Ligand binder design. Structure first.
Ligand SMILES: O=C(O)COCc1ccccc1
Length: 297
């Protein structure tokens, strides 16, 4: 059981050690398309590349490349697209991907500016009456509504294919107090946010995969997918002992490198799953408590 593994590693202070063994066991696959010279300005970081086997391809003949990976968790029947924060020049590619993959939700785990630097382009409209047109990909995006909580925001966007005049409603879930290379306040507000995404239908098999991003799409994004998948597997098995977090993480790392970027993100992941297990095992009331301790009011 993970709760006892947690106490062992915590008492022995072995997190940096567990983390390094995950690093050493992690898959390595070619990322040849990412490293082509014509794709240099489509990557936010030179050392974070999608693997060729799991990369999302854009449906445009010129250049199909985006820094995005499909994570497919077969047993949990969950799939996620993990991507970098879009660049000024890839905002159009980002929304094209959302359109082509039939995603219903975008989960953003960073602020546009962190530590006095830009982590992401402003890729959605700030005001209802000021819509965004992406000329390169022939898409229009309108802000429909915005609901602000203390530490996260939920926006209703309308995405229109200008080529075909079809429109879709996209939900933008913006977690607004998660530091880069860091961990949420307590897992409470984290979990509260995760259960909000689930409640929306965005993670449901009726829709294309949810798009998840932070700055590089591996750290904070990794922590989101790892907690969701572990809780689901727990749910499907009704057995907290049967879930090995370290094995699930290594499976996900077959699809995108570097998921979980620090030993404290690994520790937080355990803490999020352990706390979340209360709910999965039948204490439905624990969800009301999370809203309270989150102070989302
Ligand atoms: O904490 C995160 O979610 C992402 O980490 C930033 C990063 C890590 C490695 C390489 C480039 C950027």
């Amino acid at each position: 059981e993970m709760e006892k593994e947690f106490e062992q590693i915590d008492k022995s202070g072995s997190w940096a050690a567990i983390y390094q063994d995950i690093r050493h066991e992690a898959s390595d696959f070619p990322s040849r398309v990412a490293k082509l010279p014509k794709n240099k300005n489509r990557n936010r970081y030179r050392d974070v590349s999608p693997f060729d086997h799991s990369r999302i391809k854009l449906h445009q003949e010129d250049n199909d490349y985006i820094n995005a990976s499909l994570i497919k968790m077969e047993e949990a029947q969950r799939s996620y697209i993990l991507t970098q924060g879009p660049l000024p020049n890839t905002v159009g590619h980002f929304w094209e991907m959302v359109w082509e993959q039939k995603s219903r939700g975008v989960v953003m785990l960073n602020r546009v500016m962190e530590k006095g630097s830009l982590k992401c382009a402003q890729y959605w409209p700030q005001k209802e009456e000021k819509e965004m047109i992406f000329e390169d990909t022939n898409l229009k995006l309108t802000l429909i509504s915005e609901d602000i909580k203390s530490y996260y925001t939920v926006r209703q966007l309308e995405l229109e294919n200008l080529t075909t005049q079809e429109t879709r409603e996209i939900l933008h879930f913006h977690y607004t107090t998660w530091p880069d290379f860091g961990v949420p306040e307590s897992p409470a507000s984290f979990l509260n946010f995760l259960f909000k995404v689930r409640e929306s239908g965005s993670l449901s098999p009726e829709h294309g995969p949810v798009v998840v991003h932070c700055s590089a799409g591996i750290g904070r994004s990794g922590t989101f997918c790892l907690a969701d998948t572990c809780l689901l597997l727990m749910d499907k098995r009704k057995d907290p002992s049967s879930v090995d977090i370290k094995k699930v993480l290594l499976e996900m790392r077959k699809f995108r490198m570097g998921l979980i970027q620090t030993a404290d993100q690994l520790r937080f992941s355990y803490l999020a799953v352990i706390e979340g297990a209360k709910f999965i095992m039948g204490d439905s009331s624990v969800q009301d408590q999370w809203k309270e301790l989150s102070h989302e009011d």
